[PDB]
Amino acid sequence: RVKKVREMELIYARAQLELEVSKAQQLANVEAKKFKEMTEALGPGTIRDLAVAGP
Amino acid sequence: RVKKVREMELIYARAQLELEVSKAQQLANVEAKKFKEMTEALGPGTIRDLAVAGP
């Protein structure tokens, strides 16, 4: 009785893991690509000057 | 009984994942393209001067 429930929940958890990792995966690809476009929009020296804007 | 429900919810979650990642995807492409046009409108040195406007 319990082993079938444990086995069934096991394969569900494996696929639920694929749901979780894909959520982390794609939400980070867009997070990284947006950062790619954000920092490319400004410029290498420009972002450095903006971050170190202080005398 | 449970396995069919778990399997059915699994494929729904897979497609719901595609809904979530597409939402993150396209909302970031517009976020990045708008930033592309925003920083291109000002200029490379101009944005640096605006961000480091301090003596």
Swiss-Prot record, chains A, B:
Subcellular location: Cytoplasm; Nucleus
Post-translation changes: Phosphorylated on Tyr residues after EGF stimulation.
Domain notes per entry: MVP 3 mediates interaction with PTEN. MVP 4 mediates interaction with PARP4.
Function: Required for normal vault structure. Vaults are multi-subunit structures that may act as scaffolds for proteins involved in signal transduction. Vaults may also play a role in nucleo-cytoplasmic transport. Down-regulates IFNG-mediated STAT1 signaling and subsequent activation of JAK. Down-regulates SRC activity and signaling through MAP kinases.
Quaternary state and interactors: The vault ribonucleoprotein particle is a huge (400 A x 670 A) cage structure of 12.9 MDa. It consists of a dimer of half-vaults, with each half-vault comprising 39 identical major vault protein (MVP) chains, PARP4 and one or more vault RNAs (vRNAs). Interacts with TEP1. Interacts with PTEN and activated MAPK1. The phosphorylated protein interacts with the SH2 domains of PTPN11 and SRC. Interacts with APEX1. May interact with ZNF540.
Protein name: Major vault protein
